[PDB]
């Protein structure tokens, strides 16, 4: 179980002087999703190439999914999977786009009905609001739940804006049977935001059971 953030560990939005829009675009409407697809190519040893078409509304037809190691890529290379993640158009090597993790086995992973997960949001130690996200997967990546949670917060609580964020710090915590892990929601200090390096935290393809996962979001103000 990952230790909770220590004092001063979380990234402070005030120490990031670049455009927060670069963070915001990762969690806006434009996300990559595909159902029951099998990898067609391999750029490197730890990535998989998929033929995901969203050419009607999206603007990327081939996507490279990068994993933490060779074992993850081997596990899903010849299997039909579902893909869900936030895409980094910035630059990889491989129009085209890239992402990290967000891959789950398709067979046997669907529920009949959408399952609701209640997100509990805290601000400065006191709970702010609670809201539901939905998934129809028995096993869901933390990335998909993280995207759904932040997409709601962007649309409804202005979590990220074009210039800044109204919140100084933020981390999202997933709890599964007294075992927990968390992600920092704020960009690293500096005047540039490296989208690819940030999204790399998803490359472990971490999965949780949608039945009993609990999501908590902790925010602080300036």
């Amino acid at each position: 179980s990952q230790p909770d953030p220590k004092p001063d560990e979380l990234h402070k939005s005030s120490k990031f002087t670049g455009l927060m829009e670069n963070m915001k675009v990762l969690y806006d409407d434009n996300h990559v999703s595909a159902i029951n697809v099998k990898s067609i190519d391999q750029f490197r040893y730890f990535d998989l190439i998929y033929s995901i078409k969203d050419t009607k509304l999206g603007n990327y037809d081939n996507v490279r999914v990068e994993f933490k190691n060779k074992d993850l890529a081997d596990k899903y290379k010849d299997k039909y999977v579902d893909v869900f993640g936030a895409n980094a158009y910035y630059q990889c090597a491989f129009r085209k786009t890239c992402m990290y993790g967000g891959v789950t086995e398709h067979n046997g992973n669907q529920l009949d009905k959408y399952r609701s997960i209640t997100v509990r949001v805290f601000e400065d130690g006191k709970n702010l609001l609670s809201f539901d996200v939905q998934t129809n997967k028995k096993k869901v990546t933390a990335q998909e739940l993280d995207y759904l949670t932040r997409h709601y917060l962007v649309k409804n609580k202005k979590l990220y804006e074009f210039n800044n964020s109204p919140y100084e710090t933020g981390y999202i915590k997933f709890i599964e049977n007294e075992n927990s892990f968390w992600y920092d929601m704020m960009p690293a200090p500096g005047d540039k935001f490296d989208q690819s390096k940030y999204l790399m935290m998803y490359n472990d393809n971490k999965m949780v059971d949608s039945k009993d996962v609990k999501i908590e979001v902790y925010l602080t103000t300036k």
Partner: antibody
Amino acid sequence: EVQLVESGGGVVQPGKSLRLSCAASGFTFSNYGMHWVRQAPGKGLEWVAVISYDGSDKFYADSVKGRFTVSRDTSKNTLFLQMNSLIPEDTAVYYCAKDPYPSQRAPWNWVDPRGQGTLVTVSS
Amino acid sequence: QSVLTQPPSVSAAPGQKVTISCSGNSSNIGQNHVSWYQQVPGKAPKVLIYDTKERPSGIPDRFSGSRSGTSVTLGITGLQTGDEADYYCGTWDSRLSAVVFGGGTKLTVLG
């Protein structure tokens, strides 16, 4: 712009029943939970009930539990409050209020009343 | 009487500033963010503050909110005659599974 219009109030004998309606417009009704709040003449605000956006949660004030029921119809965009065994202490102006954000669950730390309310008077 | 506690009344001259306190339990205010509502005499209540400090659109920055432990405070500066109203604090109570209001504070702008 969001509009809430309460209706159905009137003079009622004690022990009788009355049904209130709140017609909603200007937002996707089924995405938002809804609240009822009342105010007796010259007294403070008192929260009555909430129904969640999907209707699965219904919570009531202790003073109305077992007598009032919140219901909801998506097709006519209407919130209802069925009031049974009315007592003179139920005399109040009743306001409906919408959840600020979609898909909310407890805690509801604020509500957004937008109507003029409807007056119900329970007197013999 | 009332689950949340606020003073019955407060008053000051136009242009002055006032504060209205609101105190509760570990079950409501020590747990949750608080909202404020103003009700001009004879009119309907409307949201004035939410998330303990945020203002809805149309509410000027003369109105502010703050928190100190198990109590919260609403601040009004540059008092105007139109500010004369009843003010209510509100929040969720997890013990009662209800939103609870204070008893209300009557603000008079002294004329």
